[PDB]
Amino acid sequence: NDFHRDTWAEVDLDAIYDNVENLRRLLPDDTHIMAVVKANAYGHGDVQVARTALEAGASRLAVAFLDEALALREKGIEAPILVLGASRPADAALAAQQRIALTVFRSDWLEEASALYSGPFPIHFHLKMDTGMGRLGVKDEEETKRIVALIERHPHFVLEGLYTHFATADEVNTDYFSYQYTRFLHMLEWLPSRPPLVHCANSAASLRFPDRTFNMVRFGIAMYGLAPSPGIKPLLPYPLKEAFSLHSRLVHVKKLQPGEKVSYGATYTAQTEEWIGTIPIGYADGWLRRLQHFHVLVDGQKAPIVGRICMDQCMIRLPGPLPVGTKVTLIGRQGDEVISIDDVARHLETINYEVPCTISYRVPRIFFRHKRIMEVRNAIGR
Template identity: 60%
Template sequence: MEEQGYFYRDTWAEVDLDYIAENVKSVRSHLPQDVTIIAVVKANAYGHGDVQVAQTALEAGASYLAVAFMDEAIALRNKGIKAPILVLGASRPEDVEVAAKFAITLTVFQKEWVQEARKHLEGNQSISVHIKLDTGMGRIGIRNAEELISIHQLIAEDERFQFEGVYTHFATADELDQTYFQQQLEIFEKMIAALPNRPKYIHSSNSAAALRFPKAYFNAVRIGIAMYGLTPSLEMEQEIPFTLKEAFSLNSRLVHVKKLEKGDKVSYGATYESEEEEWIGTIPIGYADGWIRRLQGQEVLVAGERSPIVGRICMDQCMIRLPRYLPIGTTVTLIGTQENQFISVNEVAKKLETINYEVPCIIANRVPRLYKKNGKVVDLKNDLLNNYQA
């Protein structure tokens, strides 16, 4: 097919950049205009494609990006992204000069880190930092006002460090019970009140809080899962103030079709046995692609109908029970829409007994991503820098 110009297996994901843009615009219209949107594009933009999503989000109303590690930030810089980028996770103090070189903002949460990092900035290099507060997530962050003030003083003493932001992360913003969320918010407010001066950015809200709690906006919010059209949790589905458009779909094609007789078996362990004559199709996707063995029995869409995966999923292939004979080359949709049927990321997550965040993240990089922009599937592999520079 035409859009497969650079890969040679009939399995691919499609990412609808128009949907991502619409989701960001919906969030933008939901927030006060003076609240900055920080688009979270860590983990290859939750498996959707880092530079493609980053540029789309910036065009749609975000003005800052966030990633997990310096490696991800540098990758975006090397792909032409010039917007501010915040590293949310821990960075080594000896790498601070690299961060300065690439104009990457780092997260600070240890006094010792600041002391060590000061030794590694060269000449007139400078770096922006955000201080992370642990108000109850229990991951990384400063846990009391005294330590916050101490770190703030260290930063203020060195003009090469620009104190640009302070933030925290909510553990339960997507749950109906707001008790723990409220506790975290109160702790955050008390800690930032202890600062002798406030930085440019104060942010606490993830997607869930940004959609639900105006009192937690401050002057910036971090939008992750909602940008991709996915609900932060099933519990809060009814509280989302606008329609989210799911951007990720996963497709394959039949590469082999055969008729089984009653009693014939399929795949490793011979765990599936046909009860009557039936048509079985093979598709080239397996657990090495992130379509893991636990998805045995999950339905897919073929010819506009639901068909189950039968037998154990192999490393590179799996088999489905067809509703009837269908020709080789027929499209199979594992996630997404086909005719009037839809298989959501949430449905696959339920089968895996996990959350929707995990599903696109675990679809391996060897599954090529195609991108829909202005309603058309486009091949961005060969000219990303021409079309997607900030």
């Protein structure tokens, strides 16, 4: 695959292998790892991360909605995939044919699906319980038993799993975590029998309490080498390896005289004789306008973004006359200096999860494995 703009993101797949393998070491052998690659693997490349995670010890994959699961199938992934979110009852036949497990949390969904499906493939369900997140999931005993009965009555419906999700597993203070875990324990007793897969842990819960994970963990953010929250960094068992880096190159260089203005709204004004560089990356690439007072790395040094950010490019003050084509690093390391996703996140005033997800389809992803380039993936490519 190829790309024709000097702006690209690099994804280090060795880092992803390490982050997942260290977890395989940490957890009991009887506990499986479900790698969650929703949102195109948190903006890292769905099938590439999936292939790598399965190599390091993962056995299942999790995705947010049906299309994401189907896309993984079309690219040759044969491992089990669980759709964590909602789906249409009409799509039950397609899920069953493609061996995609579904999350279920209401009986009226099942009422509706028994009526539209009748074999021959089995559909594996994972009952979702709401123990305090308030998102999706059952909350009463009458509804829990209704779902289980409806599943038991259809010969092609199978209850393969049961799970919940924590809202504060990444907080140093475990008070709410405890209420939720205890509630899950109370809620599991409402089932006539334990299905084979009971899971509740996300990255934070499984890295902090490996013995409290039952038989399957849903590993996300930590797989990419990003800490679940600033709170728990020191509580992490093994060092995490950041996998995403973002780069560009100088396409224009020029010296300004005192008084000349730069960019939209002509916000910036040079005061001495300064060198301004232009890079081909803007907000349509996920490098949002709010980052106008941030900086990038040029030739081992910090250089500020100058003026407002444009849709496809932005300007930065240079230390002096640098050659056109000089590599600029937006996220990553250049010498002794480094800009991490948490740094960008802080400036954007968000969590690290939101940063790689926002780097758009427009930006090519170059995959590295064994310290060498594996493949290039340009979404708007030929």
